[PDB]
Amino acid sequence: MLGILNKMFDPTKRTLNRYEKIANDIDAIRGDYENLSDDALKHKTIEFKERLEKGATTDDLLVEAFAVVREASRRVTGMFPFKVQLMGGVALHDGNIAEMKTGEGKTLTSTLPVYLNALTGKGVHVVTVNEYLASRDAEQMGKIFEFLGLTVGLNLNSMSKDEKREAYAADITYSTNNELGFDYLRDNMVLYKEQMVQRPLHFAVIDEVDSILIDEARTPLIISGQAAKSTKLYVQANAFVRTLKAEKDYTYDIKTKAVQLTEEGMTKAEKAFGIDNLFDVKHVALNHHINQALKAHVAMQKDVDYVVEDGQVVIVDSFTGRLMKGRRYSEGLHQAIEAKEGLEIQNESMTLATITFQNYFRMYEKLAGMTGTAKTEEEEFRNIYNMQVVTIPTNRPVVRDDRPDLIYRTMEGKFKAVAEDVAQRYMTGQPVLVGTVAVETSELISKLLKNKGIPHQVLNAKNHEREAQIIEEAGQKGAVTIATNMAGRGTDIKLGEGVKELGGLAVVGTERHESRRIDNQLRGRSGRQGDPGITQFYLSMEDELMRRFGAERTMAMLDRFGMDDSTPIQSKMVSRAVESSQKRVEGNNFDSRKQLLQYDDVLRQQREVIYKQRFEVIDSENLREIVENMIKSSLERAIAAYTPREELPEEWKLDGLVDLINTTYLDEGALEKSDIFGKEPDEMLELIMDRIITKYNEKEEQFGKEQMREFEKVIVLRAVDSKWMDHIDAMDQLRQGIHLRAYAQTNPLREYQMEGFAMFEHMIESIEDEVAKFVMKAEI
Numbered sequence: 001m002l003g004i005l006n007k008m009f010d011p012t013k014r015t016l017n018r019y020e021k022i023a024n025d026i027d028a029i030r031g032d033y034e035n036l037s038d039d040a041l042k043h044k045t046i047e048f049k050e051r052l053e054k055g056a057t058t059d060d061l062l063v064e065a066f067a068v069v070r071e072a073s074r075r076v077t078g079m080f081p082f083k084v085q086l087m088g089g090v091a092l093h094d095g096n097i098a099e100m101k102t103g104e105g106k107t108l109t110s111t112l113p114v115y116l117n118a119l120t121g122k123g124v125h126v127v128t129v130n131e132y133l134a135s136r137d138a139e140q141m142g143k144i145f146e147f148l149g150l151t152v153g154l155n156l157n158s159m160s161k162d163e164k165r166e167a168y169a170a171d172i173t174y175s176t177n178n179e180l181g182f183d184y185l186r187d188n189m190v191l192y193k194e195q196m197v198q199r200p201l202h203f204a205v206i207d208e209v210d211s212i213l214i215d216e217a218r219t220p221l222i223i224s225g226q227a228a229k230s231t232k233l234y235v236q237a238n239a240f241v242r243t244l245k246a247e248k249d250y251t252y253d254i255k256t257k258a259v260q261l262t263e264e265g266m267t268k269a270e271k272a273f274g275i276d277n278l279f280d281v282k283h284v285a286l287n288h289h290i291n292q293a294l295k296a297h298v299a300m301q302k303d304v305d306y307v308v309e310d311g312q313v314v315i316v317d318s319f320t321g322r323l324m325k326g327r328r329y330s331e332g333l334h335q336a337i338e339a340k341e342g343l344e345i346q347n348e349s350m351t352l353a354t355i356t357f358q359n360y361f362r363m364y365e366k367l368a369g370m371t372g373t374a375k376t377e378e379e380e381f382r383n384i385y386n387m388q389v390v391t392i393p394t395n396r397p398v399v400r401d402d403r404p405d406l407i408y409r410t411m412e413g414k415f416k417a418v419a420e421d422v423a424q425r426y427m428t429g430q431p432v433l434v435g436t437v438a439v440e441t442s443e444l445i446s447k448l449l450k451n452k453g454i455p456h457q458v459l460n461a462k463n464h465e466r467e468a469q470i471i472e473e474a475g476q477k478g479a480v481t482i483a484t485n486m487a488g489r490g491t492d493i494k495l496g497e498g499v500k501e502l503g504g505l506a507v508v509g510t511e512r513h514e515s516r517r518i519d520n521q522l523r524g525r526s527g528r529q530g531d532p533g534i535t536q537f538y539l540s541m542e543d544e545l546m547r548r549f550g551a552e553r554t555m556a557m558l559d560r561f562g563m564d565d566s567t568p569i570q571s572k573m574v575s576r577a578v579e580s581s582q583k584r585v586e587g588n589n590f591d592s593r594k595q596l597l598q599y600d601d602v603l604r605q606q607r608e609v610i611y612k613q614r615f616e617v618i619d620s621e622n623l624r625e626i627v628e629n630m631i632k633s634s635l636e637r638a639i640a641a642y643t644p645r646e647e648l649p650e651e652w653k654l655d656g657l658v659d660l661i662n663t664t665y666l667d668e669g670a671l672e673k674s675d676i677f678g679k680e681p682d683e684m685l686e687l688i689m690d691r692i693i694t695k696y697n698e699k700e701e702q703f704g705k706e707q708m709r710e711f712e713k714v715i716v717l718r719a720v721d722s723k724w725m726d727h728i729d730a731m732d733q734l735r736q737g738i739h740l741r742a743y744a745q746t747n748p749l750r751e752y753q754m755e756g757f758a759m760f761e762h763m764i765e766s767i768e769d770e771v772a773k774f775v776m777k778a779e780i
């Protein structure tokens with residue numbers, strides 16, 4: 001609830017002039033390295049490392065470091081970065097967004113501050129959108145860093161949990177956004193601390209930062225795959241519809257508890273499966289399901305504070321009436337859904353880890369970013385991520401002709417018009433690139449060109465390697481490309497022999513996008529480095545962004561403002577109005593990603609807690625914190641079990657409270673002062689501590705350097721398994737289709753926080769039984 005996003009914050013043009021000066025300072029010492037030997041140069045890396053630790057700052061050696069990388073580059077790649085690029089680096093070094101246009105040299109610029117900030121040995125992460133663009137940048141700029149005496153590392157989805165660590169080991173590491181997200185999450189599902197692949201998140205430099213932080217924001221990162229030896233076993237758990245005498249366990253208190261089972265059930269239930277009463281021989285599975293299925297019949301019921309069907313189960317609110325869409329029953333009460341009544345089964349995928357890129361990337365101590373289009377959502381870059389967008393003067397003045405939208409009346413005429421324009425361009429031999437929004441519209445224009453027999457290339461948004469090769473050749477004479485929205489990103493389109501003289505790459509958008517950012521991106525592909533190029537969008541009156549005008553009629557003027565689909569139309573007015581629709585569409589998207597951020601935030605805080613607690617259960621032998629924790633978890637279960645079977649009218653009739661003790665914690669001799677034995681809550685501390693601590697001491701004596709072993713595979717499991725994976729899944733469920741009546745979107749923020757901390761309070765409690773019961777009742 002701090003400030004409010006999109007309103008206003010600090011400046012430009014004190015920041016730029018400062019940079020300018022720096023660049024010119026860089027050029028000043030340009031001679032100090034130019035005739036230096038190769039060895040003397042490499043030595044600078046060391047010299048910098050020595051200076052930094054002795055007391056100097058990154059900022060203190062900027063001019064120079066940058067000057068060294070510049071000279072290096074010129075010697076390794078052939079390219080001596082321009083002042084505009086030098087400026088870029090500063091923009092990034094300040095943890096800002098460097099906005100430079102397509103064809104400007106971002107990757108080069110990234111080496112500059114990447115180097116500077118990699119000298120600490122803390123590491124640096126150079127982020128791109130996809131595998132290929134990493135591997136490439138890694139392989140090409142790899143050279144320049146290595147030359148200065150630094151380790152480059154490439155992180156891919158293929159690599160072993162070993163090779164990955166070894167890459168995060170490198171001074172500099174390259175990766176796709178996703179892996180960075182994944183590797184983090186996977187690190188927090190680990191059984192031994194080594195397995196983790198990541199180091200502390202120091203610095204991140206996203207290239208194409210808009211796609212990553214603005215567009216790909218609206219998806220969470222999900223991990224899924226379920227292995228509860230599920231569907232099959234749930235039917236089998238439900239085989240116990242009959243003779244629920246010997247195992248029809250005791251009743252309970254508060255929200256829920258059926259755990260206990262008389263010896264006669266267990267044994268014979270177990271012979272119906274084939275082992276003993278399970279101790280922690282991958283047994284947990286059967287005990288938890290049998291409890292669940294046993295509960296689904298007696299404990300949790302039908303038609304009052306439990307379930308109502310449709311074809312499946314929907315939690316209700318017995319007093320309000322309405323169906324709580326999106327509410328999963330904790331730790332696998334699918335049992336109700338599936339077999340108790342109607343085979344409405346439910347088990348496929350399972351969410352095991354979730355994160356937003358806005359939370360993930362905010363974990364880093366420093367974020368910097370690069371892209372051609374990022375002045376638009378600037379109020380967000382500085383309000384969500386604390387980065388100012390710097391707009392960087394191009395190296396060479398743009399001589400492109402971004403033409404005013406042409407407006408046809410219907411799809412067909414607009415499409416036909418697109419064909420014609422490509423038709424004319426091929427015949428001239430001028431290369432054409434056609435931006436599309438949808439694979440299906442991508443296909444239609446191709447057919448249009450297949451009837452006209454105009455050789456071309458479609459570009460589907462997938463298999464990036466091929467399309468990169470395609471894209472270089474889209475700047476050659478007679479080239480014809482049609483690029484699915486987000487196709488060929490990251491690659492320059494270099495114009496061919498004498499293509500300059502035909503006007504350069506001509507670009508044709510088949511429609512304006514959900515965001516002017518995307519709109520300008522398209523135009524971007526054309527005017528790089530001061531080559532000519534023309535860009536033009538086509539719009540039909542016949543769709544979205546154009547509804548403003550559905551119901552428009554006239555008194556004395558040309559009705560519809562572009563009639564009969566003969567020719568096109570132009571007016572600033574209509575184009576102006578398209579902007580509204582665009583900007584309004586941009587609004588929705590902001591809101592939907594704000595809400596996501598707001599949803600993950602609940603998870604974020606929830607998850608940092610559990611992550612921290614898990615790892616602590618892993619570093620558990622010298623303080624005997626696995627027993628100290630196991631002791632707390634036990635004392636909870638009691639204090640909770642004790643204080644309901646004793647309300648404020650009366651602490652009375654101890655009989656089920658007796659059962660509880662015996663078939664939850666301790667053997668038959670779970671009776672003492674049978675009932676009405678005085679009457680206290682804190683009498684329960686002594687008497688249950690007695691029968692449990694004495695037993696724990698004796699349980700840990702017969703087989704005791706192992707019980708530590710025993711707790712660990714008990715605690716960590718039940719924590720990991722029922723709690724986290726079931727919460728994570730159940731959460732993503734509520735996030736999803738919390739679309740029951742009487743909620744408004746992102747107000748559910750209110751319901752979500754509420755129902756999701758409720759859930760957590762419980763899941764923590766479920767953990768607390770699981771561990772107490774098992775330590776006490778699982779024997780060889």
Ligand SMILES: Nc1ncnc2c1ncn2[C@@H]1O[C@H](COP(=O)(O)OP(=O)(O)O)[C@@H](O)[C@H]1O
Nearest residue numbers: 079080081082101102103104105106107108492
């Ligand atoms: N200073 C330079 N000298 C020579 N060539 C350059 C220079 N800067 C960039 N280039 C070339 O122009 C292309 C554009 O640079 P790039 O790093 O891709 O930036 P952008 O992503 O803005 O296009 C690259 O393929 C590179 O080979």
